[PDB]
Ligand SMILES: CCCCCCCC/C=C\CCCCCCCC(=O)OC[C@H](O)CO
């Protein structure tokens with residue numbers, strides 16, 4: 606599976622290699638450092654929304670372990686020989702990223718429907734169609750990327766199929782947001798709109814990284830892609846989580862929860 610990603614095609618200078626290694630290790634520290642934040646502040650969240658901050662904790666660890674795994678797999682696969690890091694063992698690949706998205710994405714969406722105050726049959730209903738839409742996006746995306754070295758034409762076709770799911774998914778998100786924000790408290794009806802525009806931006810970086818092999822097939826594209834994933838990672842999971850948390854705390858205070866009213870105070 607590693608021989609199917611362009612990373613196995615190029616030698617990397619010490620700067621390109623150590624720069625990629627530093628992006629992955631940094632992502633580990635950022636996520637686990639955020640994990641502590643999401644853990645501590647959970648007490649200041651009412652029981653209604655407390656599950657939202659717990660989902661962020663699960664997202665931080667899920668992303669941290671894979672990023673840490675990517676880093677080690679990045680140092681075990683290459684060795685500095687004759688002035689450049691050259692492949693050695695087939696272990697590094699971007700497929701592990703996609704397997705992670707299968708888990709983190711359902712968590713990122715579910716904590717969005719919690720702060721929106723959805724409940725009952727609608728919560729279980731809107732959650733199933735979104736996840737099935739998300740999984741369809743990730744699976745078809747995992748198939749196309751297997752061809753990013755052999756058949757770029759297939760990468761396009763699968764990227765197109767994956768985009769159909771992505772558009773439908775966002776449409777359901779945007780539809781529920783703008784039809785349920787009036788219920789939110791403490792003025793969070795305004796914050797939830799920015800979160801959606803924060804989603805449309807950070808999430809769109811992934812299909813761009815997915816297309817790096819097409820318009821930049823070289824060692825600098827491997828670097829740009831990992832840089833794009835990093836920027837998108839800390840925006841779809843960290844910054845995104847911080848906003849979800851802020852919303853969960855604000856509505857908690859507006860609902861009469863003392864630990865939340867004393868925290869903001
Ligand atoms: C043969 C090739 C496969 C072709 C067929 C698979 C690909 C379908 C792709 C996009 C449409 C998916 C959307 C289908 C679901 C529409 C209903 C819906 O999503 O609404 C849920 C509701 O809004 C929740 O509250």
Ligand SMILES: CCCCCCCC/C=C\CCCCCCCC(=O)OC[C@H](O)CO
Nearest residue numbers: 765768769772775776777778779780783784
């Ligand atoms: C292969 C390429 C195919 C790409 C095709 C491009 C079409 C993109 C159009 C819209 C994006 C939809 C994003 C969802 C925006 C939410 C807006 C919404 O839901 O409507 C507001 C609501 O009705 C008020 O209550």
Ligand SMILES: *C\C=C(C)/C=C/C=C(C)/C=C/C1=C(C)CCCC1(C)C
Nearest residue numbers: 746764767768771808811812815841
């Ligand atoms: C870590 C968090 C998230 C939300 C990862 C999300 C990934 C995507 C939104 C990926 C989308 C893709 C599409 C729309 C089509 C090309 C292939 C991708 C899977 C990269």
Ligand SMILES: CCCCCCCC/C=C\CCCCCCCC(=O)O
Nearest residue numbers: 736737738739740741742744745748
């Ligand atoms: C538990 C993971 C499966 C989730 C199924 C729900 C998602 C539905 C979306 C499309 C799934 C398509 C599965 C078949 C694709 C075959 C491609 C392949 O793996 O070779």
Ligand SMILES: CCCCCCCC/C=C\CCCCCCCC(=O)O
Nearest residue numbers: 737741744745758759762763766767
């Ligand atoms: C979950 C309900 C069933 C829908 C499952 C979705 C199946 C995948 C969607 C369409 C795939 C079309 C692209 C296939 C390209 C194959 C090219 C080739 O093999 O030569």
Ligand SMILES: [Cl-]
Nearest residue numbers: 702705834838
């Ligand atoms: Cl990722």
